[PDB]
């Protein structure tokens, strides 16, 4: 039965916001089992509150927040949760006073800045959020979540060149996960330029050697190579090696979809052959 | 094993001191937890440490990225007067509550013998293992209590685990980063990959 | 002939100078 | 391998020490039970330690190098910290069974 | 969790051996023989207790793990990676409901 606890913990660990199941299991486990659980419920309240905000209810929010208040009176985290409550109901300046206060009584506190920025972004404004986030990063380096958010924001502003610099800062450290290299390759391939596609195939490869079961990296390599084999600016040797790259990748994709098939094979073979 | 000893000794002087030392080695841990402090020193130092660590990791594994980028940051760090390192300028507690208690004991449980150690010892160490006795004829395996206490101490170390300047630093980073090779180190992955086959059998 | 070809088009430690 | 988690490492080291510092005590109590004195007791420690290593090898099927890079920790391991404990349990049981 | 019972059985049997041997020792010091060794039975009992207990404690001691990072990345996707919980915002469709 305790499985519910471990599933909640899982969703806490690998952030998996869906805020439909969470609130259910929370309200189930917010009951008498609380006294059974023992000194562990508080995190479950901090986790159910946010998912509830995500579901629209807002009724369970104050119950969880007031439990938190009564246990931890002079806290800071519950203050952040009150700021969240405010900004959901669209009291922005109040929340700003709050965050500036608990930064004023604690300058080396990050969460207040990272909520001020969420507010600045929820208004619609981006360009000032970016410089605020950089002025933050100008002090609190080693904030990987921030680097990834910055990369996403530069992407949605259609500046694909500095997002790559952030991804460099972010896959230099923790260089054992495919996702970062893959997203770097997608950035570059989108950026255009042969000098970049030569990197796109490289990193779509390295991101495959690691996992060796990813699929997006595979199609990425296939498309990068196939497009190299038509750009009339490279010596023959380039094109002849990219042809074999693409053909081998095609064979491997054939293997994969064959495993899958136990009608798709038709369409994928068409895609293969048409070039 | 030639002697016959009172069982009351076992009861009332042996187990007490295989217990006391255990609970004191626990309390020492819990109190050390309750004691340690933690500063809020400054934004400046934390930022400086963070960037120094960025430099460290750069020097360590800055060889999975384009060369020009590595060189660009290396320039932003080393470039004369632009480089970041060229613009910014600025036991006892353990031992003592163990040595103070042996004394209490040897002042309290003094005038008798406690137990035997099954390996023969050297004779010169006798006068300090017994400490009450006036035989000067026994072998030294027959000990007093204090020795049992200290033995317990050393024997229960390993069984709690089972149940539980700025500018110079900057300049040294700069100097150790001057001499550095990119060594891109990704320039055969393509072949290596498409060398035997693709490997996945968990679908 | 690739039918669907698309073309879409200060951070501390970022310069563009092709430094050697 | 090239890329190491460095957390599973300490976990494995811990699940070694949790076997070693226990078996040490156990062998000590055993020796104090079937009372044997001086040299032979020490021999028993070595023998027990050796047997322990073997079991680990049989729990780490096929020497698998994904757990450890080298089998040295299985043989050497934490072997001095095991000594004092063996001594203590030896002494305890001797003083608790044969004297009294 | 049968291995726990196995270990407790080893311990109980070992204690029984210790009791038997203490009382035998008393017999010895009482009949003033002090010449003979221990009966075999006690020895076998204690030794088997020891071996069994080790074989069980190895199992219940825990479980090994790989030291290759990407082993635990095989099952993972952008959806986990992308969320960035410290940058959440709620002015979206869900607030309708
Ligand atoms: C001679 C006396 C000294 C040692 C004898 C060996 C038995 C040691 C057991 C008592 C120690 C203890 O402190 O026992 C706590 C555990 C609680 O379980 P655990 O989480 O530590 O499991 C182990 C998994 N690990 C290691 C990853 C956390 O009890 C247990 O398992 C032990 C179950 C007892 C079986 C009866
Ligand atoms: C008799 C009553 C014993 C009172 C002592 C007690 O109850 O607390 C100490 C241990 C049980 O605490 P714990 O081993 O579960 O670790 C707790 C630490 N934590 C939370 C990190 C896992 O007592 C024990 O084991 C008793 C050990 C027997 C030796 C005498
Ligand atoms: C704990 C580890 C297992 C202990 C082994 C054990 O069992 O040690 C044997 C004694 C004998 O037991 P007894 O009192 O019946 O004979 C003696 C009664 N006398 C002296 C008045 C004639 O056990 C005891 O009593 C010792 C009681 C303390 C538990 C150790």
Residue numbers in the entry:
A (entry chain B): 12 to 273, 280 to 292
B (entry chain C): 4 to 93, 114 to 187, 213 to 251
C (entry chain D): 14 to 22, 43 to 53
D (entry chain F): 11 to 110
E (entry chain E): 4 to 100
Q: What do the paper's sentences say?
A:
The ER membrane protein complex (EMC) has emerged as a conserved player in the process of membrane protein biogenesis. The EMC is an eight (yeast) or nine (mammalian) component, 248–284 kDa complex with considerable mass in the ER lumen, membrane, and cytosol. The EMC is comprised of cytoplasmic, transmembrane, and lumenal domains arranged similarly for yeast and human, despite significant evolutionary separation. The EMC presents two distinct and structurally conserved cavities on opposite sides of the transmembrane core that differ in size, shape, subunit compositions and apparent function.
We obtained reconstructions of yEMC bound to an antigen binding fragment (Fab) and hEMC reconstituted both in detergent micelles and lipid nanodiscs, with the latter strategy yielding the most isotropic and highest resolution data. Comparing detergent and nanodisc maps for both species identified two major gate conformations. The other conformation, referred to as the open-gate conformation, would provide space for client accommodation. By contrast, the hEMC nanodisc map reveals an open-gate conformation with the unassigned helices shifted away from the transmembrane core to provide space for a client. By contrast, the one map with an open gated cavity displayed a lumenal rotation and concomitant shifts in position of the hEMC1 brace helix. As noted, we resolved several lipids in our cryo-EM maps lining the cavity wall and modeled four POPC (1-palmitoyl-2-oleoyl-sn-glycero-3 phosphatidylcholine) molecules in the hEMC nanodisc map. Density for the hEMC7 beta-sandwich at the hinge between the two hEMC1 beta propellers was relatively weak in the consensus hEMC nanodisc map. Additional rounds of 3D classification revealed two distinct classes, one with clear density for hEMC7, and one with weak density in this region. Mass spectrometric analysis of purified hEMC, however, revealed that the abundance of hEMC7 was similar to that of the other hEMC components. Both reconstructions, with and without density for the hEMC7 lumenal domain, displayed well-resolved density for hEMC10.
